[PDB]
């Protein structure tokens, strides 16, 4: 205990003031195999669940908090603060610290802490109170030397791993919860950092709180700092009490722990069921059941404010990611340059009519690939954060839609500028200000509709691969339905209806009606089938398709769970 750091600050700067919280699990029988789990913890004690802390896809902490995607056959009771557990009570009193961190990398610690504070604290708290709460949270977890350092994860400089875990704990601790529950806090951390994090969690539990910790294989030094320990093997509790007396318990029942051996490891190795054989499976199950039998016989703020906070956080996060913005600008510039130089109109030989039609069709139908790719990548790169912030109750999935839309709007507009403005002059299209502005507006609206379609496809499907496949299928069905590939006339019932809702066909028709109308003539439009809808009608149809895709995306965000 003398090898680790000893010159620390044992002060408690952010304590929980209020009634002591309690958590009592009585005769829990969780299957699909927890059997006869029963304990009672109060505020001021740190409970560490050692052994097999999982039951398949959902850990024990998720079962206690009510979460879990697998089966939930229930046969017991869970009383939180003296009342039966419920999603409302869990969201109101219980805070959860997941194993995988979900933080925006382009934000400092103080910025994201203030954001979470103003999104969590009620609207009656003044700004000074919010800054004071943020400062108390920073001082409590010894994060004062990193209050201005980026919290960026790997692929970015950012800060350390233990400091990132402390930042996550502070984010989950800003609203001053009464019960904290962390699963695998020392996952992927060095030994000294894990020891310091365990000491910090013990101090937090001492600060009039109830801290539960999940640890599958705790180290020898981590086990020495445990206040209360719960040994679970094959879903059955074998021991429940003080860690320092744990060995003293087993020696009392004819199971001494030899010297120079981790007690936790020695006791999870002895009572573990062996799956390599079949005759030893029950041979160890009987010992586990007898030990379990001896153990049992021995004993605010609102919606507009949330939207503003979300859009400000998004703007501050994406406007500082220089590599991604530069990559997107490079893609836009490359596309524009190849499109304008392949169809270079300045020269002795001008562009033909079919050449101009193909140029417009390519301008319309070459962006969706990169657009959908980047949009789906960005959506699946932050799905866990959104899912957890929706489960914990930060926003009500309403302001998040408009926040995301108005956050991607400026960068999308810059991309559209870079892709479309230095392409209209290189190709030597119809000169003037009105046709160029109309072309730009139509391209902007079409790419916006494509972005909304990509967002809806990414939010509707659970995995990145199937979402990308469905989006590519939709894009290809809209591409083949265009007015340039299959003549827009050799379609019987289904492809015609697909073309009626295909934004690429409408974009091509609008560009044709902008370029070739009363130029040198509408007869080239008459030999084709691009003269049955006026320009404003095409714009309104594109706007309606964008609105329908927005409604679909909103319905998918509201009803479909964004499971990572």
């Amino acid at each position, epitope marked *: 205990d003398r090898l680790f750091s000893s010159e620390s600050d044992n*002060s408690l700067y952010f*304590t929980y*003031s209020g009634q002591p919280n309690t958590l009592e699990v009585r005769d829990l029988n969780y299957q699909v195999g927890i059997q006869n789990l029963s304990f009672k913890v109060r505020s001021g004690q740190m409970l560490a669940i050692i052994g097999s802390s999982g039951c398949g896809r959902a850990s024990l902490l998720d079962v206690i908090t009510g979460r879990g995607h697998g089966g939930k056959i229930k046969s017991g009771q869970i009383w939180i603060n003296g009342q039966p557990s419920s999603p409302q009570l869990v969201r109101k009193c219980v805070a959860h610290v997941r194993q995988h961190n979900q933080l925006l990398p382009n934000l400092t610690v103080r910025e994201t802490l203030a954001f979470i504070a103003q999104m969590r604290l009620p609207r009656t708290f003044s700004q000074a109170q919010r800054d004071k709460r943020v400062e108390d949270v920073i001082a409590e977890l010894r994060l*004062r*030397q990193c*209050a*201005d*350092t980026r919290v960026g994860n790997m692929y970015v400089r950012g800060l350390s791993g233990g400091e990132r875990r402390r930042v996550s704990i502070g984010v989950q601790l800003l609203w001053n919860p009464g019960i904290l529950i962390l699963d695998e806090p020392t996952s992927g951390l060095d030994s000294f950092t894990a020891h310091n994090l365990v000491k910090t969690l013990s101090r937090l539990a001492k600060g*009039n709180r109830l801290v539960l910790i999940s640890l599958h294989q705790p180290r020898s030094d981590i086990f020495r700092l445990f206040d209360l320990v719960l040994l679970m093997t094959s879903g059955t509790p074998i021991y429940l009490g003080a860690a320092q007396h744990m060995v003293q318990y087993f020696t009392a029942i004819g199971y001494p722990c030899p010297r120079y051996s981790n007690p936790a490891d020695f006791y999870v190795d002895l009572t573990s069921i062996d799956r390599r054989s079949r005759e030893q499976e029950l041979a160890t199950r009987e010992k586990a059941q007898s030990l379990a039998a001896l153990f049992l016989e021995k004993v605010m703020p609102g919606a507009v404010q949330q939207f503003t906070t979300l859009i400000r956080r998004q703007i501050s996060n994406d406007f500082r990611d220089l590599p991604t913005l530069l990559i997107h600008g490079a893609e836009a510039c490359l596309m524009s340059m190849t499109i304008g130089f392949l169809y270079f109109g300045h020269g002795s030989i001008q562009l033909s009519f079919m050449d101009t039609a193909a140029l417009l069709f390519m301008i319309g139908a070459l962006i969706p690939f990169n657009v959908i790719l980047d949009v789906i990548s960005k959506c699946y790169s932050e799905r866990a954060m959104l899912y957890y912030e929706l489960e914990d109750g930060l926003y009500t999935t309403g302001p998040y839609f408009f926040a995301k839309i108005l956050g991607e709007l400026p960068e999308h507009c810059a991309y559209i500028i870079i892709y479309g403005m230095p392409t209209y002059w290189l190709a030597n299209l119809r000169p003037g200000l009105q046709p160029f502005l109309l072309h730009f507006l139509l391209v902007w609206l079409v790419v916006f509709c494509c972005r909304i379609m990509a967002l809806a496809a990414a939010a509707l499907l659970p995995t990145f691969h199937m979402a990308s496949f469905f989006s590519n299928a939709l894009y290809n069905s809209f591409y083949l339905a265009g007015g340039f590939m299959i003549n827009l006339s050799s379609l019987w019932t289904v492809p015609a209806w697909i073309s009626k809702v295909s934004f690429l066909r409408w974009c091509f028709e609008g560009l044709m009606k902008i370029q070739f109308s009363r130029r040198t003539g509408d007869k080239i439009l008459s030999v084709m089938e691009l003269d049955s809808y006026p320009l404003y009608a095409i714009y309104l149809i594109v706007i309606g398709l964008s609105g329908g895709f927005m409604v679909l995306y909103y319905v998918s965000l509201r009803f479909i769970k964004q499971k990572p």
Partner: antibody
Amino acid sequence: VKLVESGGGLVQPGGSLRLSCATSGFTFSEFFMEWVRQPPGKRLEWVAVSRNEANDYTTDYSASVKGRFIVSRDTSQNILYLQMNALRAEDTAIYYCARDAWMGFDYWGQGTTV
Amino acid sequence: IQMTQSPSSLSASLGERVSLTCRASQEISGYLSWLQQKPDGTIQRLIYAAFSLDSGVPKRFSGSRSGSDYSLTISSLESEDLAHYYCLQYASYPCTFGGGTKLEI
């Protein structure tokens, strides 16, 4: 927020002394209480801290005086007490009574010579 | 964390704009405080968080930061500025102070 110190005087090396810091103007049982001395010709040096009731009135001292100095607080009259033992070897200073160390040293005292 | 204050001594008369610098050995993230000890002995915090000001102090005193060096700027010095000035950090335990500067008129 007024802090006044008393209890300074001439003491032979190896004896014992007790300084008293009287506090007024705020909740004495809610904020920290620090003793921070200054040598006659050097910079300010933090000596000891006594936390509030939320920490169950636990105390802490610097590595130079850890074991010889004992800080305590009387909440009835809101008076901080600092008992010093084996002093006057190098412990001669102008000890000051401050309110908050973690939130910036604000509302200092008047200091007493020992 | 060692706090090096500059200069150790300074002489400036009425009307001048004084600037006292303080460098920290490590990163304190702006958690620096400036105190003024009068010649009588009544110490009082002048600036907290290295940028904000306490209630009741004149607005002439200002705080700034350049790189890793914090600066206390006193514009339109008065006769009440002849005193000692100390910079301290409270971002990491233990709390250390600065060398101090004797501002003399």
